Design an enzyme around this catalytic site. Structure first.
Site, PDB file in Angstrom:
ATOM      1  N   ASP A  90     -72.928 -48.326 -73.676  1.00  0.00           N
ATOM      2  CA  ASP A  90     -72.434 -48.368 -75.059  1.00  0.00           C
ATOM      3  C   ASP A  90     -71.416 -47.252 -75.325  1.00  0.00           C
ATOM      4  O   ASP A  90     -71.501 -46.550 -76.332  1.00  0.00           O
ATOM      5  CB  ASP A  90     -73.618 -48.305 -76.057  1.00  0.00           C
ATOM      6  CG  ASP A  90     -73.296 -48.786 -77.456  1.00  0.00           C
ATOM      7  OD1 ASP A  90     -72.230 -49.398 -77.634  1.00  0.00           O
ATOM      8  OD2 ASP A  90     -74.114 -48.536 -78.376  1.00  0.00           O
ATOM      9  N   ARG A 111     -67.407 -44.489 -81.695  1.00  0.00           N
ATOM     10  CA  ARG A 111     -68.411 -44.369 -82.763  1.00  0.00           C
ATOM     11  C   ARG A 111     -69.659 -43.600 -82.282  1.00  0.00           C
ATOM     12  O   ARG A 111     -70.431 -43.151 -83.120  1.00  0.00           O
ATOM     13  CB  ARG A 111     -68.834 -45.758 -83.291  1.00  0.00           C
ATOM     14  CG  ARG A 111     -69.580 -46.568 -82.240  1.00  0.00           C
ATOM     15  CD  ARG A 111     -70.091 -47.922 -82.693  1.00  0.00           C
ATOM     16  NE  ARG A 111     -70.634 -48.642 -81.538  1.00  0.00           N
ATOM     17  CZ  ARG A 111     -69.921 -49.456 -80.758  1.00  0.00           C
ATOM     18  NH1 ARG A 111     -68.645 -49.701 -81.032  1.00  0.00           N
ATOM     19  NH2 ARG A 111     -70.484 -50.049 -79.718  1.00  0.00           N
ATOM     20  N   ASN A 112     -69.882 -43.511 -80.949  1.00  0.00           N
ATOM     21  CA  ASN A 112     -71.008 -42.810 -80.348  1.00  0.00           C
ATOM     22  C   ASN A 112     -70.645 -41.412 -79.850  1.00  0.00           C
ATOM     23  O   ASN A 112     -71.417 -40.812 -79.117  1.00  0.00           O
ATOM     24  CB  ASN A 112     -71.640 -43.655 -79.243  1.00  0.00           C
ATOM     25  CG  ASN A 112     -72.234 -44.927 -79.804  1.00  0.00           C
ATOM     26  OD1 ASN A 112     -72.675 -44.974 -80.953  1.00  0.00           O
ATOM     27  ND2 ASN A 112     -72.251 -45.988 -79.026  1.00  0.00           N
ATOM     28  N   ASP A 160     -74.980 -41.084 -78.635  1.00  0.00           N
ATOM     29  CA  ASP A 160     -75.914 -42.225 -78.845  1.00  0.00           C
ATOM     30  C   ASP A 160     -76.332 -42.806 -77.489  1.00  0.00           C
ATOM     31  O   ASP A 160     -75.442 -43.251 -76.747  1.00  0.00           O
ATOM     32  CB  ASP A 160     -75.321 -43.266 -79.796  1.00  0.00           C
ATOM     33  CG  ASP A 160     -76.256 -44.426 -80.086  1.00  0.00           C
ATOM     34  OD1 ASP A 160     -77.010 -44.805 -79.178  1.00  0.00           O
ATOM     35  OD2 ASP A 160     -76.215 -44.941 -81.215  1.00  0.00           O
TER      36      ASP A 160
HETATM   37  O1  LIG Z   1     -70.949 -34.750 -93.633  1.00  0.00           O
HETATM   38  C1  LIG Z   1     -71.331 -34.865 -92.475  1.00  0.00           C
HETATM   39  C2  LIG Z   1     -71.525 -33.754 -91.468  1.00  0.00           C
HETATM   40  C3  LIG Z   1     -72.064 -34.472 -90.271  1.00  0.00           C
HETATM   41  C4  LIG Z   1     -72.509 -34.025 -89.037  1.00  0.00           C
HETATM   42  C5  LIG Z   1     -72.969 -34.941 -88.096  1.00  0.00           C
HETATM   43  N1  LIG Z   1     -73.461 -34.477 -86.869  1.00  0.00           N
HETATM   44  C6  LIG Z   1     -74.410 -35.022 -86.068  1.00  0.00           C
HETATM   45  N2  LIG Z   1     -74.690 -34.346 -84.948  1.00  0.00           N
HETATM   46  C7  LIG Z   1     -75.617 -34.893 -84.159  1.00  0.00           C
HETATM   47  C8  LIG Z   1     -76.269 -36.076 -84.448  1.00  0.00           C
HETATM   48  C9  LIG Z   1     -77.284 -36.636 -83.494  1.00  0.00           C
HETATM   49  F1  LIG Z   1     -77.013 -37.866 -83.135  1.00  0.00           F
HETATM   50  F2  LIG Z   1     -77.378 -35.932 -82.387  1.00  0.00           F
HETATM   51  F3  LIG Z   1     -78.493 -36.682 -84.010  1.00  0.00           F
HETATM   52  C10 LIG Z   1     -75.899 -36.696 -85.666  1.00  0.00           C
HETATM   53  N3  LIG Z   1     -76.508 -37.825 -86.058  1.00  0.00           N
HETATM   54  C11 LIG Z   1     -76.226 -38.484 -87.320  1.00  0.00           C
HETATM   55  C12 LIG Z   1     -74.999 -39.359 -87.273  1.00  0.00           C
HETATM   56  C13 LIG Z   1     -74.466 -39.805 -86.077  1.00  0.00           C
HETATM   57  C14 LIG Z   1     -73.328 -40.584 -86.071  1.00  0.00           C
HETATM   58  C15 LIG Z   1     -72.751 -40.902 -87.280  1.00  0.00           C
HETATM   59  N4  LIG Z   1     -73.240 -40.493 -88.454  1.00  0.00           N
HETATM   60  C16 LIG Z   1     -74.345 -39.738 -88.431  1.00  0.00           C
HETATM   61  N5  LIG Z   1     -74.966 -36.171 -86.466  1.00  0.00           N
HETATM   62  C17 LIG Z   1     -72.967 -36.304 -88.389  1.00  0.00           C
HETATM   63  C18 LIG Z   1     -72.523 -36.760 -89.620  1.00  0.00           C
HETATM   64  C19 LIG Z   1     -72.085 -35.832 -90.555  1.00  0.00           C
HETATM   65  N6  LIG Z   1     -71.667 -36.034 -91.870  1.00  0.00           N
END
Ligand SMILES: O=C1Cc2cc(Nc3ncc(C(F)(F)F)c(NCc4cccnc4)n3)ccc2N1
Length: 260
Positions: free
Chosen positions: A133, A137-138, A151
């Site tokens: 995948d 987007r990942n 992901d």
């Molecule tokens: O305003 C913000 C700041 C911010 C920081 C991050 N960082 C971040 N880092 C690590 C992970 C994980 F996968 F490892 F768990 C994660 N997962 C939620 C996520 C993943 C993909 C798409 N959307 C959400 N997200 C994501 C969104 C956002 N939105």
């Protein structure tokens, strides 16, 4: 070590939605260590042991990886509410980051992201894992000069527009099919987060690929980089480059761009 104490987690704001529930950012108060910024994945229906096993599957997979360009599993909390704690990539999803910065991110940064991802994927291959995948987007952004694969849901609906022909036709998933997907991911990066084959039906894409049609050269993409992408899209998986060769060639392309 895999199990974390809930008292060491400070839940912060919601940063997105996942398959099993909302994801929040927060802080992990590590024992005798500085507090880490983390992503806390929640699970709405994890009171069900059956949903819990499916939610925790990805954390079991992440525990065996340790690489600078792969998001790190910090731990999990198996009591209700069930949580998965990951290292936080502060700047978020790569597509949104590229779309907002279209007229401001230089080409050397885009090539750097592709290079870093090739190192994570050669590492994945070295551990007998096939991602299945690979798509922008990942990918997450830890800083302006650091991206990480985030992901692993399909690791070891179908994303047809990113899939190698042998995966679509025969359900074959190998490191060579991951190379095809990585080619599409490189195209997405060089296109500033535009999706491949927009407005094309999934079955129309299949016929186009089989007929030799490929994603076009992104504007301002160095010709050597587009040639590398077309080699990732060789119909015969034996004619695709390996992740170790992608890494070496991406490094040369990056240094040629940095030397202007
Ligand atoms: O305003 C913000 C700041 C911010 C920081 C991050 N960082 C971040 N880092 C690590 C992970 C994980 F996968 F490892 F768990 C994660 N997962 C939620 C996520 C993943 C993909 C798409 N959307 C959400 N997200 C994501 C969104 C956002 N939105």
């Amino acid at each position: 070590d895999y199990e974390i104490q809930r008292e060491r987690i400070e839940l912060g704001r919601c940063i997105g939605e996942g398959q099993f529930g909302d994801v929040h950012q927060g802080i992990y108060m590590s024992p005798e260590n500085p507090a880490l910024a983390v992503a806390i994945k929640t699970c709405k229906n994890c009171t069900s042991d059956s949903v819990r096993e499916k939610f925790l599957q990805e954390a079991l997979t992440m525990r065996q990886f340790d690489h600078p360009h792969i998001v790190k599993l910090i731990g999990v909390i198996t009591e209700n509410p069930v949580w998965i704690i990951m290292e936080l990539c502060t700047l978020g999803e790569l597509r949104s980051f590229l779309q907002v910065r279209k007229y401001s991110l230089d080409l050397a940064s885009l090539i750097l992201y592709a290079y870093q991802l090739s190192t994570a994927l050669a590492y994945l291959e070295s551990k007998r894992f096939v991602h299945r995948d690979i798509a922008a987007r990942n990918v997450l952004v830890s800083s302006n000069d650091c991206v990480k694969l985030g992901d692993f849901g399909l690791s070891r609906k179908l994303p047809i527009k990113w899939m190698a022909p042998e995966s679509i036709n025969f359900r074959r998933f190998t490191s060579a099919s991951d190379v095809w997907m990585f080619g599409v991911c490189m195209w997405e990066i060089l296109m500033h987060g535009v999706k491949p084959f927009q407005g094309v039906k999934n079955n129309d894409v299949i016929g186009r690929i089989e007929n030799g049609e490929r994603l076009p050269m992104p504007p301002n993409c160095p010709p050597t980089l587009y040639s590398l992408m077309t080699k990732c899209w060789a119909y015969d998986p034996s004619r695709r480059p390996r992740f170790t060769e992608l890494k070496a060639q991406l490094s040369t392309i990056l240094e040629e761009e940095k030397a202007q």
